[PDB]
Design an enzyme around this catalytic site. Structure first.
Site, mmCIF file in Angstrom:
data_model
loop_
_atom_site.group_PDB
_atom_site.id
_atom_site.type_symbol
_atom_site.label_atom_id
_atom_site.label_comp_id
_atom_site.label_asym_id
_atom_site.label_seq_id
_atom_site.Cartn_x
_atom_site.Cartn_y
_atom_site.Cartn_z
ATOM 1 N N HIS A 17 0.553 -0.970 0.089
ATOM 2 C CA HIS A 17 -0.047 -0.026 0.157
ATOM 3 C C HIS A 17 0.820 1.265 0.033
ATOM 4 O O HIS A 17 0.428 2.285 -0.565
ATOM 5 C CB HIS A 17 -0.904 0.100 1.130
ATOM 6 C CG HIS A 17 -1.794 -0.916 1.128
ATOM 7 N ND1 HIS A 17 -3.282 -0.833 1.484
ATOM 8 C CD2 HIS A 17 -1.928 -2.600 0.907
ATOM 9 C CE1 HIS A 17 -3.940 -1.855 1.387
ATOM 10 N NE2 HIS A 17 -3.244 -2.906 1.130
ATOM 11 N N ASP A 113 -6.345 5.125 3.189
ATOM 12 C CA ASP A 113 -6.363 3.926 2.552
ATOM 13 C C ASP A 113 -7.731 3.260 2.573
ATOM 14 O O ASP A 113 -8.712 3.829 3.138
ATOM 15 C CB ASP A 113 -5.388 2.980 2.859
ATOM 16 C CG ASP A 113 -4.724 2.202 1.800
ATOM 17 O OD1 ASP A 113 -5.312 1.866 0.697
ATOM 18 O OD2 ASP A 113 -3.675 1.667 2.027
ATOM 19 N N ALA A 336 13.732 -10.606 -6.595
ATOM 20 C CA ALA A 336 14.130 -10.359 -7.952
ATOM 21 C C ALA A 336 13.774 -9.041 -8.492
ATOM 22 O O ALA A 336 12.810 -8.515 -7.938
ATOM 23 C CB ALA A 336 13.704 -11.525 -8.938
ATOM 24 N N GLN A 338 11.779 -6.968 -10.144
ATOM 25 C CA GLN A 338 10.526 -7.536 -10.960
ATOM 26 C C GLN A 338 10.413 -6.638 -12.114
ATOM 27 O O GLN A 338 10.148 -7.047 -13.323
ATOM 28 C CB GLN A 338 9.315 -7.614 -10.014
ATOM 29 C CG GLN A 338 7.831 -7.955 -10.722
ATOM 30 C CD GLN A 338 7.001 -8.529 -9.843
ATOM 31 O OE1 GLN A 338 7.030 -9.793 -9.135
ATOM 32 N NE2 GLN A 338 5.843 -7.606 -9.536
ATOM 33 N N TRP A 356 -2.412 -6.447 -7.249
ATOM 34 C CA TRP A 356 -2.752 -5.339 -8.242
ATOM 35 C C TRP A 356 -1.263 -4.683 -8.682
ATOM 36 O O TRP A 356 -1.165 -4.296 -9.737
ATOM 37 C CB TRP A 356 -3.813 -4.445 -7.669
ATOM 38 C CG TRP A 356 -4.271 -3.638 -8.765
ATOM 39 C CD1 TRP A 356 -4.541 -2.099 -8.514
ATOM 40 C CD2 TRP A 356 -4.992 -4.139 -9.915
ATOM 41 N NE1 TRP A 356 -5.083 -1.723 -9.888
ATOM 42 C CE2 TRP A 356 -5.398 -2.854 -10.677
ATOM 43 C CE3 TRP A 356 -5.046 -5.199 -10.672
ATOM 44 C CZ2 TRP A 356 -5.965 -2.959 -11.863
ATOM 45 C CZ3 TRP A 356 -5.531 -5.345 -11.732
ATOM 46 C CH2 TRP A 356 -6.156 -4.130 -12.307
ATOM 47 N N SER A 358 1.572 -5.868 -9.059
ATOM 48 C CA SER A 358 2.288 -6.587 -9.929
ATOM 49 C C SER A 358 1.589 -6.682 -11.283
ATOM 50 O O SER A 358 2.084 -6.809 -12.359
ATOM 51 C CB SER A 358 2.347 -8.192 -9.285
ATOM 52 O OG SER A 358 3.267 -8.181 -8.160
ATOM 53 N N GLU A 361 2.152 -3.570 -13.259
ATOM 54 C CA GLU A 361 3.562 -3.653 -13.808
ATOM 55 C C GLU A 361 3.291 -4.437 -14.817
ATOM 56 O O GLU A 361 4.137 -4.109 -16.304
ATOM 57 C CB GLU A 361 4.552 -4.030 -12.646
ATOM 58 C CG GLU A 361 4.580 -3.083 -11.429
ATOM 59 C CD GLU A 361 5.256 -3.767 -10.250
ATOM 60 O OE1 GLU A 361 5.789 -4.748 -10.460
ATOM 61 O OE2 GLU A 361 5.234 -3.173 -9.296
ATOM 62 N N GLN A 378 -7.412 -11.212 -5.096
ATOM 63 C CA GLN A 378 -6.581 -11.638 -6.242
ATOM 64 C C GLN A 378 -7.317 -12.681 -7.078
ATOM 65 O O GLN A 378 -7.356 -12.712 -8.300
ATOM 66 C CB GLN A 378 -5.410 -12.360 -5.587
ATOM 67 C CG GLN A 378 -4.304 -11.154 -5.112
ATOM 68 C CD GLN A 378 -3.268 -12.041 -4.075
ATOM 69 O OE1 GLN A 378 -3.168 -13.328 -4.129
ATOM 70 N NE2 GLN A 378 -2.646 -11.172 -3.310
HETATM 71 O O1 LIG Z 1 -2.564 -6.029 0.921
HETATM 72 S S1 LIG Z 1 -3.876 -7.002 1.250
HETATM 73 O O2 LIG Z 1 -3.712 -8.400 1.845
HETATM 74 O O3 LIG Z 1 -4.145 -7.520 -0.398
HETATM 75 O O4 LIG Z 1 -4.973 -6.198 1.615
HETATM 76 C C1 LIG Z 1 -6.355 -6.661 1.466
HETATM 77 C C2 LIG Z 1 -7.358 -7.654 2.245
HETATM 78 N N1 LIG Z 1 -8.214 -7.706 1.456
HETATM 79 C C3 LIG Z 1 -8.532 -6.829 0.699
HETATM 80 C C4 LIG Z 1 -9.643 -6.797 -0.207
HETATM 81 C C5 LIG Z 1 -9.351 -6.021 -1.536
HETATM 82 C C6 LIG Z 1 -8.322 -5.309 -1.418
HETATM 83 C C7 LIG Z 1 -7.182 -5.467 -0.517
HETATM 84 C C8 LIG Z 1 -7.178 -6.278 0.619
HETATM 85 MG MG LIG Z 2 1.470 -7.107 -6.066
#
Ligand SMILES: O=S(=O)(O)Oc1c[nH]c2ccccc12
Ligand SMILES: [Mg+2]
Ligand SMILES: [Mg+2]
Ligand SMILES: [Mg+2]
Ligand SMILES: [Mg+2]
Length: 459
Positions: A17, A113, A336, A338, A356, A358, A361, A378
């Site tokens: 974040h 955030d 690495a 990335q 997100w 990654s 990128e 994810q």
């Molecule tokens: O850094 S995380 O573990 O991805 O933080 C997060 C946990 N759950 C989430 C749901 C939607 C977006 C981000 C989230």
């Molecule tokens: Mg990532």
């Protein structure tokens, strides 16, 4: 020369974040100064200090006094601990804003955030414009805004639904692929998520790290004005840059220079993207018998040592794996570069966990994906990437939670070889061009930043 207004940023826990939030701030310098007001539950890590201290001078950092979370259940999910951290740091946030306001500085905005909405109350009390920064997909933002309605129209656990969940402007998603904290509606994590989602309307705007060329459906729905819905500002893709600005000379990049164009599969699940021993063996066995060139970042499974002290993961790989792959694949422990790998012309594919940062990128550099989602949102990202944009392939998981070699090999082969992989590559290049088009000096995302900046300066 006018005095720069001051902006306070309240991040949610995680380097994942801080990265997009620092890029956001860096693109508004020197018009403003910033302070990362970082909630803590213990001593700030060296990684946090090093990253935040490396930013330009106009971005300062204040690590708020640590709060006590030992009272929370040891099984509490990360969303719960993150919400508790913010709520219990609000007095310290107030004291920090007071130091700036008491000195005469104008505090123009509070950027929070996605799980820090409880700090919006402070902003409203102090006449400070509250903004939410959303470091995930527009699809996930739409899910947040729709969660209240979904919660009131669905009683069972979402994974029990037969029909896929429909989110306004989004591709359908089966309940089993919805974000982790909604998979157990009795858990505090779901209550906290519900709590924050109902408070997005308290902000004067949501800043989302996406753009219309990547999420047309969700973005256009979000931009449509409606009562009780906050204004949205697509400013993505905000990502770090490569190392060509300091002085393909790193070890792993020398190997990529020798390989053919677009021929190497980069494997990296990111820090915290650990696999079980069984799961890592399935992946290693496919790469061992493949003719695909690969570059694999390996981490010790969760179920001898190296030079610094950490366990040596490449000694946990199966019998003579490094013998079967010696010239065709390259294994890396833990880390690495990335972005430098994704920008390399020899990189043809990216096996990722669909974080997100990654994904953005990879999109920015036109590298198609093998979507291997693990946690957070994810899985929702995987559905959008593979079934929506069709810029990646997803291997199917088994009932025991293991993705078998037959699936790993299927998606790798279809992506790097096969005709569908070529269409996927073609589509990903279109997104590559669209990504650099919105960040141009006169780009769609550069305009959104201008709108935000002017709003902060207004009055
Ligand atoms: O850094 S995380 O573990 O991805 O933080 C997060 C946990 N759950 C989430 C749901 C939607 C977006 C981000 C989230
Ligand atoms: Mg990532
Ligand atoms: Mg410290
Ligand atoms: Mg390719
Ligand atoms: Mg999670």
């Amino acid at each position: 020369t006018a005095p720069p207004p001051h902006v306070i940023i309240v991040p949610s826990a995680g380097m994942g974040h801080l990265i997009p939030l620092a890029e956001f701030a860096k693109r508004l310098l020197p018009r403003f100064t910033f302070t990362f007001a970082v909630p803590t539950s213990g001593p700030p890590s060296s990684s946090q200090r090093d990253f935040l201290s490396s930013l330009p001078a106009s971005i300062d950092t204040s690590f708020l006094p640590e709060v006590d979370l030992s009272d929370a259940p040891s099984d509490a999910q990360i969303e719960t601990l993150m919400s508790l951290m913010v709520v219990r740091s609000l007095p310290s946030l107030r004291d920090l804003i007071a130091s700036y306001s008491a000195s005469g500085r104008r505090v123009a905005a509070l950027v929070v955030d996605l799980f820090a909405t409880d700090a919006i109350d402070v902003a409203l009390e102090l006449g400070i414009r509250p903004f939410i920064f959303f470091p995930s997909t527009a699809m996930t933002l739409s899910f947040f805004l729709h969660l209240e309605k979904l919660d009131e129209t669905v009683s069972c656990e979402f994974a029990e639904l037969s029909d896929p969940v429909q989110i306004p402007g989004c591709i359908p998603v089966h309940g089993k692929d919805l974000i982790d904290p909604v998979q157990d509606r009795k858990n505090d994590a779901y209550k906290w998520l519900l709590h924050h989602s109902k408070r997005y309307k308290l902000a004067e705007g949501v800043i989302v790290n996406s753009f219309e060329g990547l999420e047309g459906g969700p973005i256009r729905e979000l931009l449509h004005p409606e009562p009780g819905k906050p204004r949205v500002y697509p400013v993505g893709p905000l990502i770090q840059a490569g190392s060509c600005e300091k002085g393909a000379r790193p070890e792993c990049l020398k190997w990529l220079d020798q390989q053919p164009r677009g021929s190497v599969l980069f494997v990296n699940f990111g820090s915290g993207g650990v696999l079980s021993t069984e799961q890592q063996n399935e992946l290693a066995g496919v790469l061992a018998h493949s003719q695909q060139r690969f570059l694999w970042v390996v981490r010790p499974p969760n179920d001898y040592f190296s030079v610094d002290g950490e366990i040596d993961p490449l000694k946990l790989l199966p019998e003579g794996f490094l013998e079967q792959t010696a010239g065709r694949g390259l294994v890396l422990p833990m880390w690495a570069p990335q972005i430098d790998v994704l920008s390399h012309e020899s990189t043809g594919g990216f096996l990722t966990h669909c974080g997100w940062n990654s994904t953005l990128e990879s999109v920015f550099h036109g590298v198609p994906l093998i979507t291997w989602p693990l946690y957070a949102e994810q899985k929702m990202n995987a559905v959008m990437l593979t079934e929506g944009l069709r810029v990646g392939l997803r291997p199917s998981v088994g009932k025991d939670g293991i993705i078998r070699g037959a699936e790993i090999a299927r998606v790798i082969g279809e992506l790097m070889e096969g005709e569908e992989g070529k269409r996927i590559r073609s589509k990903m290049q279109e997104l590559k061009r669209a990504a650099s088009a919105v960040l141009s000096k006169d780009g769609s995302s550069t305009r959104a930043l201008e709108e935000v900046a002017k709003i902060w300066e207004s009055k």
